[PDB]
Amino acid sequence: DHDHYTPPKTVFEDTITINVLDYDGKKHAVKALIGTPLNKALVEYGFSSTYFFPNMGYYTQHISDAHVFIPEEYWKYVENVDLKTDDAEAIKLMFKLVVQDYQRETSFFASYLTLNKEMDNMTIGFGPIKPWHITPKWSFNGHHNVKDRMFDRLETGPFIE
Amino acid sequence: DEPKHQIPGNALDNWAFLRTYAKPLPDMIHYYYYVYLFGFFFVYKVADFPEYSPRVLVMAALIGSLFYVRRDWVHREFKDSP
Amino acid sequence: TFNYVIPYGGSSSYTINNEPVKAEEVTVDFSKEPSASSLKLADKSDWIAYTFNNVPLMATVGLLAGAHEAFLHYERTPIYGKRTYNIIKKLAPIVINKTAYATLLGAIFCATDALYENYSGKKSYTSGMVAGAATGAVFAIGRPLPQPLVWPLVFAAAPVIADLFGEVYPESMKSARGYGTPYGFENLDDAVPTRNPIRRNPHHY
Amino acid sequence: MWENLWYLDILINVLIITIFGLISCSSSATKSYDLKGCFIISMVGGVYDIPSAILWCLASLSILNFNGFFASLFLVFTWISNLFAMQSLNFLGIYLAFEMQSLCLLVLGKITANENQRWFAYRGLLKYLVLSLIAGSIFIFHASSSYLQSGVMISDSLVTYVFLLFKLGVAPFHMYTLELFSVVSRHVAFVFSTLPKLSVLYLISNSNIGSECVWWGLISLWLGSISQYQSVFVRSILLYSSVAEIGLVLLVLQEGFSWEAFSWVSIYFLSLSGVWHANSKFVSAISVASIAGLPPFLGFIGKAQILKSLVSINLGILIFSSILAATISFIGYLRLIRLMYLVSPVKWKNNKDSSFINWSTWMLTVGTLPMVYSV
Amino acid sequence: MSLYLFMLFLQPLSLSFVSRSFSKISSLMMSFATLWSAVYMWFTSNGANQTFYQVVSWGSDWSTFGVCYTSLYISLLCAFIFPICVILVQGYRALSILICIQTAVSLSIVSLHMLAFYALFESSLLLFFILIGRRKYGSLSAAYNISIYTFISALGFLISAFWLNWSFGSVCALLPNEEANSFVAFGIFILLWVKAPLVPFHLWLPEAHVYAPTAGSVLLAGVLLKISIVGLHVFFLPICASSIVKAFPLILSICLGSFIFSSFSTLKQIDLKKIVAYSSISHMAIVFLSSATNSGLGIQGAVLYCIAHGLISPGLFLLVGILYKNTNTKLVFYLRGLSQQAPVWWSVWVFFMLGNLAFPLFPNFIAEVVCLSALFKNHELYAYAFIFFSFVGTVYSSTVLGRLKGGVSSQCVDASRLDVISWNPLVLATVVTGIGYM
Amino acid sequence: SSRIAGDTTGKYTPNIFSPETPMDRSFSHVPKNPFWEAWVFRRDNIQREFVWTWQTIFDLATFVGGLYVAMYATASFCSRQNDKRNGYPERNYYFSDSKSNFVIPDEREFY
Amino acid sequence: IAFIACSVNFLYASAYLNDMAGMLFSITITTISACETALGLALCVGYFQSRAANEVEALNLLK
Numbered sequence A: 001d002h003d004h005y006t007p008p009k010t011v012f013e014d015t016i017t018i019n020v021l022d023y024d025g026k027k028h029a030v031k032a033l034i035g036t037p038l039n040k041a042l043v044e045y046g047f048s049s050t051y052f053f054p055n056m057g058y059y060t061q062h063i064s065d066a067h068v069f070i071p072e073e074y075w076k077y078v079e080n081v082d083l084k085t086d087d088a089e090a091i092k093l094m095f096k097l098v099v100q101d102y103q104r105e106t107s108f109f110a111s112y113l114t115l116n117k118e119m120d121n122m123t124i125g126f127g128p129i130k131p132w133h134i135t136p137k138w139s140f141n142g143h144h145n146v147k148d149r150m151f152d153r154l155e156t157g158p159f160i161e
Numbered sequence B: 001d002e003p004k005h006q007i008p009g010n011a012l013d014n015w016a017f018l019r020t021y022a023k024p025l026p027d028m029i030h031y032y033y034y035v036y037l038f039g040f041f042f043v044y045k046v047a048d049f050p051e052y053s054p055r056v057l058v059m060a061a062l063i064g065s066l067f068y069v070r071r072d073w074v075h076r077e078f079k080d081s082p
Numbered sequence C: 001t002f003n004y005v006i007p008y009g010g011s012s013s014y015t016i017n018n019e020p021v022k023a024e025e026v027t028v029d030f031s032k033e034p035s036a037s038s039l040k041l042a043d044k045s046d047w048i049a050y051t052f053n054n055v056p057l058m059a060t061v062g063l064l065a066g067a068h069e070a071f072l073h074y075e076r077t078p079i080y081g082k083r084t085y086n087i088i089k090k091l092a093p094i095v096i097n098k099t100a101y102a103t104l105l106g107a108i109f110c111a112t113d114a115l116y117e118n119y120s121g122k123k124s125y126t127s128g129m130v131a132g133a134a135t136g137a138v139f140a141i142g143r144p145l146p147q148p149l150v151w152p153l154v155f156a157a158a159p160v161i162a163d164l165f166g167e168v169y170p171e172s173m174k175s176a177r178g179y180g181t182p183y184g185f186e187n188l189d190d191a192v193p194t195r196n197p198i199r200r201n202p203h204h205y
Numbered sequence D: 001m002w003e004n005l006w007y008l009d010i011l012i013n014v015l016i017i018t019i020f021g022l023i024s025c026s027s028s029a030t031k032s033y034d035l036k037g038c039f040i041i042s043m044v045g046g047v048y049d050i051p052s053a054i055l056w057c058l059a060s061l062s063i064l065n066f067n068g069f070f071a072s073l074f075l076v077f078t079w080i081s082n083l084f085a086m087q088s089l090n091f092l093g094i095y096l097a098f099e100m101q102s103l104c105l106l107v108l109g110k111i112t113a114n115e116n117q118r119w120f121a122y123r124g125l126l127k128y129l130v131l132s133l134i135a136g137s138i139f140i141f142h143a144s145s146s147y148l149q150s151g152v153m154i155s156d157s158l159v160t161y162v163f164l165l166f167k168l169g170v171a172p173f174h175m176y177t178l179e180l181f182s183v184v185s186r187h188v189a190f191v192f193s194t195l196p197k198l199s200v201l202y203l204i205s206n207s208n209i210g211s212e213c214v215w216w217g218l219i220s221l222w223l224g225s226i227s228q229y230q231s232v233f234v235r236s237i238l239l240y241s242s243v244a245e246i247g248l249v250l251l252v253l254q255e256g257f258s259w260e261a262f263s264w265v266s267i268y269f270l271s272l273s274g275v276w277h278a279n280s281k282f283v284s285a286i287s288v289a290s291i292a293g294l295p296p297f298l299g300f301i302g303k304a305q306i307l308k309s310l311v312s313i314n315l316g317i318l319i320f321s322s323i324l325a326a327t328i329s330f331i332g333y334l335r336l337i338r339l340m341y342l343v344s345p346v347k348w349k350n351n352k353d354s355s356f357i358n359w360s361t362w363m364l365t366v367g368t369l370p371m372v373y374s375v
Numbered sequence E: 001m002s003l004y005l006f007m008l009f010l011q012p013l014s015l016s017f018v019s020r021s022f023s024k025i026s027s028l029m030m031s032f033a034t035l036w037s038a039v040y041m042w043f044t045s046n047g048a049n050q051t052f053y054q055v056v057s058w059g060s061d062w063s064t065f066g067v068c069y070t071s072l073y074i075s076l077l078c079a080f081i082f083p084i085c086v087i088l089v090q091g092y093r094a095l096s097i098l099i100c101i102q103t104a105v106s107l108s109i110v111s112l113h114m115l116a117f118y119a120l121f122e123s124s125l126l127l128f129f130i131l132i133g134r135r136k137y138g139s140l141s142a143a144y145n146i147s148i149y150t151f152i153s154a155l156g157f158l159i160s161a162f163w164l165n166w167s168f169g170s171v172c173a174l175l176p177n178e179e180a181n182s183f184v185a186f187g188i189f190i191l192l193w194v195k196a197p198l199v200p201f202h203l204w205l206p207e208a209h210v211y212a213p214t215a216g217s218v219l220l221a222g223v224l225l226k227i228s229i230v231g232l233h234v235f236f237l238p239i240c241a242s243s244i245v246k247a248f249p250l251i252l253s254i255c256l257g258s259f260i261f262s263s264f265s266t267l268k269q270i271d272l273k274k275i276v277a278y279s280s281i282s283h284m285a286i287v288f289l290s291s292a293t294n295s296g297l298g299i300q301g302a303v304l305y306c307i308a309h310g311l312i313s314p315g316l317f318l319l320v321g322i323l324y325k326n327t328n329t330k331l332v333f334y335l336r337g338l339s340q341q342a343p344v345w346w347s348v349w350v351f352f353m354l355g356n357l358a359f360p361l362f363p364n365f366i367a368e369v370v371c372l373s374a375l376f377k378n379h380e381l382y383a384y385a386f387i388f389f390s391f392v393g394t395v396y397s398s399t400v401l402g403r404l405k406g407g408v409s410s411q412c413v414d415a416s417r418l419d420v421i422s423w424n425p426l427v428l429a430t431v432v433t434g435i436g437y438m
Numbered sequence F: 001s002s003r004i005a006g007d008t009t010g011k012y013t014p015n016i017f018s019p020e021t022p023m024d025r026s027f028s029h030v031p032k033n034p035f036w037e038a039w040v041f042r043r044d045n046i047q048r049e050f051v052w053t054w055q056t057i058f059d060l061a062t063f064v065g066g067l068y069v070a071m072y073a074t075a076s077f078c079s080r081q082n083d084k085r086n087g088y089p090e091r092n093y094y095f096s097d098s099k100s101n102f103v104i105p106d107e108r109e110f111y
Numbered sequence G: 001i002a003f004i005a006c007s008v009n010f011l012y013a014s015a016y017l018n019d020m021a022g023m024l025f026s027i028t029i030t031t032i033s034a035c036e037t038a039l040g041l042a043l044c045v046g047y048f049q050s051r052a053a054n055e056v057e058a059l060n061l062l063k
């Protein structure tokens, strides 16, 4: 009994940087912690509210998702979803209403990928999104010209504008 | 760690199946226009229909419910081919 | 009774009868009687005639379903791109097959219902159950395991639901009035109407 | 000339308030409370009966939450259209009043959209417009054929029934409500999903515009309930609830139960006010419960009036459908309750503008016992 | 009666004005005051008034309240068992929800108007959805189950009440009305079918009980299941006796099937709470059948057995809650050596389990004897069927006790002073009823 | 390494910062098992492994339907015997097709 | 075009029956139709001015 305690690692040790290609085409180095979902890491960095959309699930709209392109090597770390459940209904709805034609075989949602040590120096890109609407407040006209941050939105998710 | 439900299927195969819903989406106005027009004409015609037995009506409702196809179903399976 | 010593409810004498008393002095009816068309369609005497009179409904429902599916397919196809294939050739089977299957199922249901009623000689729930079961059996000819049990049940149940709430319910609750004195209890001193209330004129649409 | 004066007074009142508001337009009073009060006083000159007094109450409550002279003027225009719809005696009154109301909806929807919200709002307004044009054109064409055949314009006809079916939004004529009300402001959707109904119900009840067919209400009840259960978005849940209920109400109103529909519309207005003008979780929960029909709230009385009317007509299919559809709707309302208090931490904007919202919540709680006589 | 109703209305009222730190003390004092008012109502109820001991009306048919034999026993049971629920619950939110649920339930029992009955019983619908679906220890599935089952059954009951109000013109129990309609009987019956769990409409109960707090489970089993017997005696048998006699072979089939299938299902349970829940479902069948016989022996037996269950099931649910607090487990497999480790908890557990098995010195024995006598009055086979299958309850209870009784355990998990205080009233009441002061 | 959290005198304080573990209610919790927890999960979520097979249909119909049929038949027999015993006319039961309207015996009448 | 057709039908009926009701309904159609068109065209212009660069046939919803 009484095995050796493992001291925790410092943040410097557990910070991984990901290169994220934005809509305008600039590359940003997004430092991220291992064990965090990609959506949260992207939100904290300071991307605009236009780059993210609520998860279109019965009870998941509070989460903010993004359309991302993942390199073939990191497909393993994406999370499996049961078709006969409602998580699949969420994903199908987001593909039908947000991604649409801009879909590619590499297209995935940030919430379903969790950052790990093996994802260091990974290059991801924001995938193009079509205009979408849920409520007048929660919508995307199609113009990526607002300079706010998704972090600065306190309201958790859509309900009634 | 906690016990979790087993998900049938491989991760990439399920995601590929989900990605077949990401197709050009038509506007719903086109469907609505036709439904409104035909529905108005249908309501006008319904006043002249013969009186049907309740049993026949219920059976027709059942058949219509069974034969109704959800819009998502056609959307996922639609192929632009012969 | 609201006591623990004697049985609740009551007993009514079978020998003693109460002579019927009219709800009102003058009765004005705003409910029209069944049309001659309704009786003609309802006549199950000749199975072939019964079937041919009642199939229009199934055909219409099949046509609506086929039109729906055909429109969904047509809407997606792109006008801007020229298509090698003919759209009507692709879409016509959808509508035709849906209409044919719906008409066939409704024909089976109507035929079996009329044939059983004639052979039995009585109007009964069983006729609807056996017609539904036969339709559900035809629906589930090649379907996997659960469906052969489920469809004969759902289809058999549907005429039961129609009979219970379309025929038995209204006839069972014809006497209840709602105005004047309760149907059973006319001794009680409640205001007696000269005429029944006419809440609406007989419909004509 | 004296009978004409009653009608003339409303016009004179509206014009003088309009020109006063135009002359006294300043940044210092963007919220023209004085004009809102003048408009409310003006609309008291059109109250002649109990339904007109309900029209006044609802219009005044709606006017309170509109900001600016322009929106309040267009609400007064909506009120005038609604008042004239109740008094319409032939096809011309019906067409004129309803199309004026459609114009007021198009303006109110257009002037309450931000620049960032124009893409979706203007699309939904255009789709509403085109569908309204189909409805109005089919109505007027059939009305012309009827006038030619009969020589007289009589408001007891299938043509008017189908048109008023479109206006109510039952059977397959409910899609305009879904498309338009999803993309517009919450207040505009609330005031135009409740107030217009009263005029149509009054017209139907007074002009004997009823049909023997029960298919349209049965369809609305089932479609609305199933679509409410399958809808991910909360605006769609609320929009489909109105479809289902107005389908049932249509079935009840055809059979002559005018009093119950006029009491229902008032309770539904009060119940919908707090859910639509969401600011507090508790107010929204009490509203959802009232729409659901839970017994401690006034919503129970409103639903009870309709259900009580249904048992009198003694149609079994309607009662069975009603029970199952109500259960399906209840699942959607439970979803709404789950979203607020059982899914995730909820943070909402501090829009502290609860004009009649506290009063409505109080009226929902307290009103059950006074109105128990009805049921 | 007026004092009881006033105290009932004051208990939710008191919370609005308390300091938010005195909430628990005030709630306990209010619960005891409501119990004392119920005792006063019993004192002011003369047996000379055979039909209704007391009837009060406050201006309308809806506000007509009255106490009968069934109502008196159930109201006293609710007032007796509420203090235990109060002490077991902590937090203003929890207290508010519990006090509102109790007020609604206690007002439903004394109501004599079907529409008022519906208004009061179903008011506590969202509160149970929120209580069973609490953030960490609750299940959304159980909340949805209970809520949907209640809504569908109560809506059917409401439709029947509306027809009776339209046809007769009143729906108050005090006005003698009889109906032979089968649709209306079915509408009233479906509520009873669901509320008192009867196969196949019993699925909502076990889920709710497992994921409810101990105060909630105690209230549910103790009195919420009994609300069916008040509806049967007060709102079903007076008006729809003809339909119960017409359908007696079907009623008997469904009740016996419920008793058998529930007993067999209890055998596959590994969770203590699920075992207690399925025992309740099995026990409800005898009460339902006995009342449906429409005989003096049956109505009295059903009410007596209901009181015995309302004294024995809260005890088992309380002991299970205490054990779970001590160990954070409800799996019988993890719990071993409880005899040696908790001699005081074990003694009370064994006593309550003996009570659940209807042994002679327990109220269950007398109640069962009366109910079986009523069944034997109907037919000898009816009684025999129920008597024979009672062994299944013994098999599951014996297996559970044996698994818990012995083994190796390294944890002393015994009741504290607070836990003994909470069960002492239940123990004394069980003993007193067992000796014949029913 | 341990300390007594409870104080009978009433001067109880939670030493959240104590190096030594408090002997609170959590001291007596039983250690769970990875395999037992998965067994519990599998037992509760047994609907996932449900499959409609002929054996399942056979077993369900034979025991559940079979018991229900036996119970209905017995109840019908007992009702028939009681009616014969009491001397009442054949009662109009729900599924019985009887050309008699008798349901509730008249208390005044002597059978 | 459709509204004009209906108004013409009303004018035809008024000539057939020697009645003024159709002429008044027809003037009402002219007024309401013009107001509806003006509002709809305003909405169309506003919709077109807000179009994002990606959108191609914004006006052609039925595509």
Ligand SMILES: CCCCCCCCCCCCCCCCCC(=O)OC[C@H](COP(=O)([O-])OCC(O)COP(=O)([O-])OC[C@@H](COC(=O)CCCCCCCCCCCCCCCCC)OC(=O)CCCCCCCCCCCCCCCCC)OC(=O)CCCCCCCCCCCCCCCCC
Residues within 6 Å of the ligand: B034, B035, B038, B039, B042, B057, B058, B060, B061, B062, B064, B065, B066, B068, B069, B070, B071, B072, C061, C064, C065, C067, C068, C071, C150, C154, D171, D172, D175, D215, D218, D219, D222, D223, D226, D227, D230, D317
């Ligand atoms: C050329 C133009 C193309 C159009 C063609 C025609 C144009 C219209 C002309 C005239 C239109 C008027 C009449 C048409 C039907 C009225 C509906 C309507 O117009 O609304 C506008 C509607 C669109 O409105 P929307 O609001 O935008 O869409 C809402 C949905 O969420 C849409 O979203 P969704 O589609 O993705 O979701 C669908 C959802 C929507 O839900 C519904 O469809 C609800 C409808 C349910 C019943 C409707 C009332 C029935 C009463 C009929 C009254 C007559 C009979 C009288 C007595 C009957 C008593 C019931 O339902 C489903 O999930 C699929 C299941 C289908 C029904 C579900 C019930 C299953 C029960 C069967 C039990 C068997 C299972 C057992 C085994 C299960 C194992 C556990 O347009 C149409 O759908 C028209 C298409 C016409 C096809 C109808 C097929 C038969 C028609 C008559 C049969 C009656 C049953 C209705 C079935 C489906 C109707 C939708």
Ligand SMILES: CCCCCCCCCCCCCCCCCC(=O)OC[C@H](COP(=O)([O-])OCC(O)COP(=O)([O-])OC[C@@H](COC(=O)CCCCCCCCCCCCCCCCC)OC(=O)CCCCCCCCCCCCCCCCC)OC(=O)CCCCCCCCCCCCCCCCC
Residues within 6 Å of the ligand: D041, D042, D044, D045, D047, D048, D049, D050, D051, D053, D054, D056, D057, D258, D259, D260, D262, D263, D264, D266, D267, D363, D367, D370, D371
């Ligand atoms: C003070 C005395 C009041 C006692 C009685 C009131 C009657 C005398 C009116 C005296 C005024 C007091 C207002 C109280 C009632 C309002 C009614 C009314 O006024 O007209 C009725 C009265 C004659 O109509 P009627 O008595 O209804 O009978 C006609 C037929 O029987 C046909 O009409 P009907 O519809 O009543 O037919 C009988 C009906 C049976 O109908 C009934 O039984 C009605 C039940 C009463 C319910 C009351 C709630 C209604 C909400 C409206 C609230 C009032 C707003 C006040 C607006 C006007 C303010 C003055 O049978 C039916 O089946 C039809 C269905 C009726 C609707 C169903 C009822 C449900 C309503 C919704 C309840 C749902 C609950 C929601 C929330 C509840 C929470 C507790 O008209 C007048 O006497 C002249 C109107 C003059 C008003 C303004 C003119 C004065 C100022 C002139 C210049 C203004 C500019 C300067 C401004 C000055 C201030 C700055």
Ligand SMILES: CCCCCCCCCCCCCCCCCC(=O)OC[C@H](COP(=O)([O-])OCC(O)COP(=O)([O-])OC[C@@H](COC(=O)CCCCCCCCCCCCCCCCC)OC(=O)CCCCCCCCCCCCCCCCC)OC(=O)CCCCCCCCCCCCCCCCC
Residues within 6 Å of the ligand: D281, D282, D285, D286, D289, D295, D296, D341, D357, D358, D359, D361, D362, D365, D366, E012, E013, E015, E016, E092, E093, E096, E097, E100, E101, E103, E104, E119, E120, E123, E124, E125, E126, E127, E130
């Ligand atoms: C004259 C001399 C003076 C002597 C005094 C005599 C005066 C007589 C009465 C005056 C007493 C004051 C009345 C209280 C008003 C505010 C009460 C309140 O807000 O509740 C929570 C509040 C606790 O506040 P809090 O902890 O500080 O945090 C609340 C925050 O604001 C927000 O917190 P949150 O966002 O975290 O929400 C969490 C929520 C979890 O979320 C939910 O569960 C939502 C569920 C929706 C409603 C629940 C449905 C079921 C409710 C059944 C009704 C309960 C009684 C059952 C009896 C059956 C009656 C048919 O949990 C709760 O809020 C508490 C759960 C249980 C309380 C629900 C009962 C309240 C019903 C409606 C309240 C009245 C508001 C009217 C508004 C007026 C103007 C705005 O008050 C309480 O202590 C418990 C409720 C007391 C109920 C008595 C109120 C009467 C309602 C019964 C209806 C009968 C008709 C009315 C006639 C009454 C006598 C004439």
Ligand SMILES: CCCCCCCCCCCCCCCCCC(=O)O[C@@H](COC(=O)CCCCCCCCCCCCCCC)COP(=O)(O)OCC[N+](C)(C)C
Residues within 6 Å of the ligand: D033, D034, D036, D037, D038, D040, D041, D044, D057, D063, D064, D065, D352, D353, D354, D355, D356, D359
């Ligand atoms: C028997 C009655 C029961 C039946 C019900 C129907 C009958 C109605 C009876 C009572 C009606 C009471 C209506 C309650 C309205 C609540 C008052 C209100 O809305 O005040 C607003 C008024 O807001 C305005 O816009 C003022 C503009 C006009 C002010 C009033 C107009 C007065 C005109 C004369 C009315 C007299 C009637 C004329 C003759 C009958 C103030 O709220 P806000 O400042 O906007 O936000 C509140 C912020 N917070 C609460 C969070 C602090």
Ligand SMILES: CCCCCCCCCCCCCCCCCCCC(=O)O[C@H](COC(=O)CCCCCCCCCCCCCC)COP(=O)(O)OCCN
Residues within 6 Å of the ligand: C120, C122, C124, C125, C126, C127, C153, C154, C156, C157, C160, C164, F095
């Ligand atoms: C909600 C009701 C829907 C039924 C639910 C049953 C379970 C669904 C399974 C699908 C099976 C198809 C439906 C069969 C139910 C009918 C009962 C069969 C009894 C039977 O065959 O007798 C018939 C009369 O029963 C009758 O037809 C009238 C009996 C009324 C049905 C039972 C009413 C209460 C059931 C509700 C239980 C719980 C509700 C939850 C669904 C024959 O009569 P006959 O006149 O032809 O005599 C013969 C002279 N040729």
Ligand SMILES: CCCCCCCCCCCCCCCCCCCC(=O)O[C@H](COC(=O)CCCCCCCCCCCCCC)COP(=O)(O)OCCN
Residues within 6 Å of the ligand: A058, A086, C161, D229, D230, D317, D320, D321, D324, D325, D327, D328, D331, D335, E141, E144, E145, E148, E149, E152, E190, E201
């Ligand atoms: C003339 C009409 C002809 C007949 C036509 C019939 C057509 C349909 C009628 C069905 C009406 C019954 C309404 C209950 C529907 C079942 C419950 C919905 C299933 C469901 O998934 O609910 C989830 C939880 O529900 C639960 O956990 C509840 C479990 C199941 C409830 C059991 C139902 C109560 C008892 C049933 C009958 C009892 C007596 C009948 C008289 C919540 O889903 P979500 O919130 O995540 O939504 C996300 C979208 N998937």
Ligand SMILES: CCCCCCCCCCCCCCCCCCCC(=O)O[C@H](COC(=O)CCCCCCCCCCCCCC)COP(=O)(O)OCCN
Residues within 6 Å of the ligand: C164, C168, D311, D319, E156, E159, E160, E163, E182, E183, E184, E185, E186, E187, E188, E189, E243, E244, E247, E250, E251, E254, F093, F094, F095, F096, F097
């Ligand atoms: C298959 C086994 C049956 C399952 C039920 C088992 C035990 C339930 C007994 C409940 C006790 C009182 C209820 C009264 C009757 C309900 C069921 C009795 C059996 C039954 O279905 O008889 C039917 C008549 O009942 C009717 O016509 C009404 C049937 C119930 C309607 C279903 C849903 C109604 C909901 C309405 C809500 C409120 C409406 C209020 C206006 C047909 O028997 P039959 O006499 O025609 O014999 C012809 C056969 N050859």
Ligand SMILES: CCCCCCCCCCCCCCCCCCCC(=O)O[C@H](COC(=O)CCCCCCCCCCCCCC)COP(=O)(O)OCCN
Residues within 6 Å of the ligand: E381, E385, F061, F062, F065, F066, F067, F069, F070, F071, F073, F074, F076, F077
């Ligand atoms: C798809 C769903 C269903 C598919 C599978 C169903 C398979 C089950 C079929 C057999 C089930 C048991 C047999 C009972 C019904 C047999 C035939 C029914 C006809 C009938 O009533 O005959 C009576 C049977 O004896 C009786 O009165 C009952 C004798 C058997 C009861 C005792 C057997 C087991 C005891 C276990 C306890 C169960 C009952 C507890 C009270 C005696 O004829 P009759 O003289 O009454 O004349 C009445 C006019 N036909």
